[PDB]
Design a protein around this ligand. Structure first.
Ligand SMILES: Nc1ncnc2c1ncn2[C@@H]1O[C@H](COP(=O)(O)OP(=O)(O)OP(=O)(O)O)[C@@H](O)[C@H]1O
Ligand SMILES: Nc1ncnc2c1ncn2[C@@H]1O[C@H](COP(=O)(O)OP(=O)(O)OP(=O)(O)O)[C@@H](O)[C@H]1O
Ligand SMILES: Nc1ncnc2c1ncn2[C@@H]1O[C@H](COP(=O)(O)OP(=O)(O)OP(=O)(O)O)[C@@H](O)[C@H]1O
Ligand SMILES: Nc1ncnc2c1ncn2[C@@H]1O[C@H](COP(=O)(O)OP(=O)(O)OP(=O)(O)O)[C@@H](O)[C@H]1O
Ligand SMILES: [Cl-]
Ligand SMILES: [Cl-]
Ligand SMILES: [Cl-]
Ligand SMILES: [Cl-]
Ligand SMILES: [Mg+2]
Ligand SMILES: [Mg+2]
Ligand SMILES: [Mg+2]
Ligand SMILES: [Mg+2]
Lengths: 142, 136, 136, 142
């Protein structure tokens, strides 16, 4: 039965805190499996400044860390342990979200509109791309 | 408790058929009130080139009421509305006035063209102050 | 050399007045050919509720030709066109068919509402294969 | 007279190479001043993984470096030296582009649609935001 994708940006509490009741409600409808995905973004510009000569941490360690934080966030959702799965990817958030939505495949993607503290843009760049490009239903949470 | 706005384009059966399961589900979560709205478009271009709106509104209301019979919803929790104007304008205005907690809309009319999101879905998902479910 | 497509909404004087200086400038860079297009909208909603298009097309052509007289462009480098359909559809189709090297469009009808980019400008800037100047 | 903003992402040759003839042509119309801006993007997510405990280079040095590369890119435009100015900022590219467009103020912003090598998205996140949110004309170059 139903598969729901919940992209999580571990860098912000509220983008997560907002979706909780929606993800739970959508899941309870028919005991769906809920896949949570955090994406460690690629750094093309910093790359051009010589930062990877210059050094960022190993991607293997960055993913292990991002995964541990995602795992803590997942536990904030009241969902049975067998209906949940944690994923970490590397890339543009929108690219990897859309890739996973296709690969699973997702029947619904549940995302926040944007970061709370910034009002100006009514839709964030990832939310906007995902809404437009997903092949499945997309719930934009406000 | 919750209020759900369901904009319906009475001229497209598939846009309407597509959201049925989602509306029914979303309503049942907490016995929400469901408002259906259809909007008779403004024709400003035609105005530049030179029946009664009363009558068009009654026909649209009649067709929306028949469409509502395709949804399993409690009769006492449902309301139908007809408006005149740009659809996105009147959808957004009703979302603020109700106010709506969710708007449920289909993405676009699928066809042989390259678009992925319709002009009204795009404006609604962007400008609504509440959550928006874009159905595919 | 270059081909410039200039979609005109004949019903809005300001959308048209706003691009005049940009079209004139863009043309003069290299003595470009300028194609003006106005699109008579499709009314599928009205079709669901139940004069001649020949006649509407001739009136629109006539109004577009009068609008073209507000531009300083060489008469031999200008062409006017009228189409029927969704404006963005027919704009994009003509941009591919000419093909256009640039499309020059105004952003939106400014008014008391929150929108910043009109439905046709948005689709054109996104889907055109060539450069697009969005005029403010 | 006229002021043109040309946002440049120093991390890609073609996003730059494409705009050249357009920027020159727009400038020659009436001897406009051309402001070039590169934005060093803020790294909220990497921040949450402890990378700034963990270390990226000093922002002062990152800006000096980004500026030196921008300066080389600017010289690829056939423009008089007194009608050109280089800027570096820190933040979201779209935020800082829009800020500068307002502050100058810009009469036109000239931007590429997206990165060449990625076809999927017809408009990049920064291009899309700038087109929508700029108060002035925006030329999207393809
Ligand atoms: N790195 C990420 N990994 C997983 N999901 C993400 C990531 N970034 C964003 N998202 C998803 O997209 C939602 C909306 O965030 P988005 O990035 O589009 O807004 P924003 O941060 O305000 O925009 P911008 O990133 O353009 O500043 C998030 O709530 C989350 O669901
Ligand atoms: N006239 C209308 N009245 C009420 N709601 C509408 C109307 N038109 C569209 N909608 C709502 O918006 C949805 C998406 O339709 P939209 O018009 O955005 O797609 P489209 O017709 O493919 O795009 P466009 O009208 O740009 O060509 C519909 O499922 C419906 O929920
Ligand atoms: N009927 C049309 N024919 C030809 N070009 C048009 C037509 N309508 C709009 N355009 C082109 O698109 C531009 C922007 O108009 P647009 O319709 O996108 O704004 P809007 O009317 O504010 O939005 P909407 O029609 O969504 O409410 C116009 O300046 C014109 O270049
Ligand atoms: N860091 C930057 N500083 C200055 N301008 C930028 C920056 N990033 C993008 N731009 C401007 O925006 C244009 C289009 O790039 P955009 O980032 O929107 O496309 P993309 O890289 O394909 O998208 P994404 O960044 O969403 O992957 C660039 O050509 C450039 O003019
Ligand atoms: Cl926005
Ligand atoms: Cl699209
Ligand atoms: Cl907008
Ligand atoms: Cl796109
Ligand atoms: Mg973000
Ligand atoms: Mg429609
Ligand atoms: Mg219009
Ligand atoms: Mg980019």
């Amino acid at each position: 039965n139903r598969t729901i994708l919940v992209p999580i940006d571990i860098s912000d509490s509220e983008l997560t805190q907002r979706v909780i009741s929606h993800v739970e409600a959508e899941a309870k409808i028919d005991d769906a499996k809920v896949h949570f995905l955090t994406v460690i973004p690629s750094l093309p510009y910093y790359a051009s400044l010589g930062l990877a000569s210059a050094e960022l941490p190993a991607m293997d360690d960055l993913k292990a860390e991002a995964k541990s934080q995602l795992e803590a966030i997942i536990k904030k959702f009241n969902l049975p342990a067998d209906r949940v799965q944690a994923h970490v990817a590397e890339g543009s958030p929108k690219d990897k979200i859309l890739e996973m939505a296709k690969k699973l495949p997702a029947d619904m993607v549940i995302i926040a509109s944007h970061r709370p503290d910034i009002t100006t843009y009514l839709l964030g760049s990832n939310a906007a791309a995902v809404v437009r490009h997903a092949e499945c239903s997309v719930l934009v949470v406000r």
